[PDB]
Structures are given as C-alpha cells and as structure tokens.
C-alpha cells in the first residue's frame, strides 16, 4: 500500500525568556517516530519508536545537527515576520514549517509538502507542482515574489523527489531549509 513521511517544525519566541523554543517531530505513516526538543536537558533527536533504536549513533548525530541548524534558521525568520507584520518584539509568536511526502505501492513519490504558518494562520505553501507557491496575505506575497525569483521551490523539490522518498523506504524496514537569503522569508 501507500505510505507517508511527515515532519513538523515549530519555533515559539519567548521575549525576555531567551531564544525561541524549537521543536521538530517526525511521522512515518501516521506514527510519531522521532522528536527533537531545544528545551531538553540534552537537546538532540530521539527515537519515539522501538524500531528506530536500531539506528547507529552516526545517523542520530547527522539529523540532530540539522535541527540545531534549523533552530538558527527559525530565529532569523522570526525577526523578519516580526517586522513584516509590524508587530512588537515583546510579544510571543510562532513560526511553523510542515514538510514530507506521500508515496505509492511502487515506492515512488505521489505528493510532496512544504508549508509555512505564522501564529496559527497560513502564510505560504508549496503547490502540488513543486514549482509554484500559494501565499495567504500581502506579506507572504512579498515572500513569494523573491522565492519565485530565486527558485526556492526547486530546492525542496529535489528533497521531496529525492531522499524524502528514500528515507521513507529506509525507515519502513520493520532535508532542512535553504540558507540562500533570497530563499528566506
């Protein structure tokens, strides 16, 4: 049958209480199989299922480093959205990124995802073509313009059609955001 991998990245700015809390959870099919927390005593990716504990320490070391880098990716874009909406830097705000892929019985890609939400409302999302974007408001339309100009959609498209399919096939044995300034919010 068909399968699905899905990651959820949430960053919540706590003004005066330190740098925003970063959390990343993963879902193979529809089971939470991995999880990262920045407020943990030893912040790293953790296996949330017994069948992921078989992975070597090299694997966990690699995927953790991405999250710690993604944590830096979100703190920067939180500053941007703070200015885009003309909000004060003394309030709490949340930036969310959802991505993953649906596959078929063949094993090939069926649908890729790349969605961004701010304060619980939709912002910008990758279309089914994996080439165009759908913006929610005017501020996101400003974001889409530079993303179509830089071709940020082709960054994720290689992931969704690539290792996202491959990593899903791997976990069934029973990545991050671009750092091009124009490809940012």
């Amino acid at each position: 049958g068909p399968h699905s991998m899905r990651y959820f990245e949430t960053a919540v700015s706590r003004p005066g209480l330190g740098e925003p809390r970063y959390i990343s959870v993963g879902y193979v099919d529809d089971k939470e199989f991995v999880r990262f927390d920045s407020d943990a005593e030893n912040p790293r990716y953790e296996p949330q299922v017994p069948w992921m504990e078989q992975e070597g320490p090299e694997y966990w070391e690699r995927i953790t480093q991405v999250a710690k880098g993604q944590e830096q990716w979100f703190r920067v874009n939180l500053r941007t959205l703070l200015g885009y909406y003309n909000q004060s830097a003394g309030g709490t705000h949340t930036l969310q990124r959802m991505y993953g892929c649906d596959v078929g019985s063949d094993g090939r890609l069926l649908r890729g995802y790349e969605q961004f939400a701010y304060d619980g409302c939709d912002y910008i999302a990758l279309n089914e073509d994996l080439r165009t974007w759908t913006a929610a408001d005017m501020a996101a339309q400003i974001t889409r313009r530079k993303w179509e100009q830089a071709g940020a959609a082709e960054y994720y498209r290689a992931y969704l059609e690539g290792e996202c399919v491959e990593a899903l096939h791997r976990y069934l044995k029973n990545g991050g955001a671009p750092w091009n300034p124009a490809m940012m919010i």
Partner: T-cell receptor
C-alpha cells in the same frame, strides 16, 4: 559540492583571465569568490545569491552566474601582474557555513 | 581585521596538546575553523552558532572545539599528529558572508 577543475593557470600579461567554478546543487546557492594573495589572509572579491547574475568586484573582476550551466565563472578582460595569486570559490546552501573549492593559483607572466 | 588568531606560528610535537584561539570584535554569532592543504583548498573542521554552541565540520576528527563566549572560538588538538600539520584559518559569520583572520601555520614533528 564545488569544483575548480583548473588547479593552475599560467597567462601572459594583459590577456584575459577565466577562473572556472561549478557547483553540484539542485538550486541556486550562496556563491563567493575569495582571493589569497601570496602570504596573506582571505579577502572577498564578490558574491551572489539573487538579482543580477553578472556581479562586479574590485580590481576589475566580474563574475557571471549561469543557473543553466550551474557555474560561477570569474572573468577579467586585462589581467595585471599583481593579480598573481590563488582564487577560491565558496558555497553555502544547506548550512550557514562556506564550503570551498580546491582553489586555483594564477601565474601572470610579464 | 577585527578577527585575530593566536598564535600565528606554532611548532608542535607528536602527542602534545595544541590550542588555537580566535577572538573577534564584530558581534557575529557564527565562528568557523578551517585548515588549508594543497590539493584540497579549504576544508571545514568545526563551527559555532553562538556562546556554548559547537558543531562538527567536514573533517572534525582529531580536533575539539570550544565557544566559551560570543567573541572567542578555540580549536583544541589533544593528540597532535603530523597529519594536522597545516595552515589554519578562523572566521566570523554575521549572515552568510565570512571574515577571515591572518591564519596560523602549525607544524607537528616526530
């Protein structure tokens, strides 16, 4: 991945200089050109991430980006003898850190 | 520049403890440690996102990193090997662009 296929370039003075740099990425990465004059640190010539694919730099150096060719070639119409140095092509995309090419030493012959 | 390394020259010994230090005055959150070897250009060893942060580079084996403050990023060679004989560069990482230091020549002999 980043490749500077020419490790060495020997040119006559006043001629044209073309330093070659290709990158192995599915999308436009943050590109840089650093120069290392003999017994000196690294100095930035130019960079690109969006906008005009042709970027001007100091010392009469211009670099052209080609998404099709996936290259960031560094060109100069008339090279001086003082330009004899080593040029590095850097790249950033997946991480906020720069991955470097193997560098190219240029030797202007007077 | 506003990025300084100490020492600039160090004669080490196989098995000895070597510590490279890099201070900055730019408030750049990111700091980097590279080494240069002919035929390989510039390779990444360790970097940092801020005070207390330590991230592995492309070739971290043999080296240890330390970020005690925003300004200081240190490289620690506990067991010095002749393979660690190279020229080392430090950097500050405000945004995507990088600002290098004058570099440090390290030789490890038997």
């Amino acid at each position: 991945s980043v490749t500077q296929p020419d490790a060495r370039v020997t040119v006559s003075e006043g001629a044209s200089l073309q330093l070659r740099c290709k990158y192995s990425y599915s999308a436009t990465p943050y590109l840089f050109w650093y120069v290392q004059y003999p017994r000196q640190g690294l100095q930035l010539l130019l960079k690109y991430y969006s906008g005009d694919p042709v970027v001007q730099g100091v010392n009469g150096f211009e670099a052209e980006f080609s998404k099709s060719n996936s290259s960031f070639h560094l060109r100069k119409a008339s090279v001086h003898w003082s330009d004899s140095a080593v040029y590095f092509c850097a790249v950033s995309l997946h991480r906020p850190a720069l991955t470097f090419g193997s560098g190219t030493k240029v030797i202007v012959l007077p | 520049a506003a990025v300084t390394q100490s020492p600039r020259n160090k004669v080490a010994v196989t098995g000895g403890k070597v510590t490279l230090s890099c201070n900055q005055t730019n408030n750049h959150n990111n700091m980097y440690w590279y080494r240069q070897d002919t035929g390989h250009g510039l390779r990444l060893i360790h970097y940092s996102y801020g005070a207390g942060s330590t991230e592995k580079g492309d070739i971290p084996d043999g080296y240890k990193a330390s970020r005690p403050s925003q300004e200081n990023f240190s490289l620690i060679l506990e067991l010095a090997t002749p393979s660690q004989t190279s020229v080392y560069f430090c950097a500050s990482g405000g945004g995507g662009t990088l600002y290098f230091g004058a570099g440090t020549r390290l030789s490890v002999l038997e």
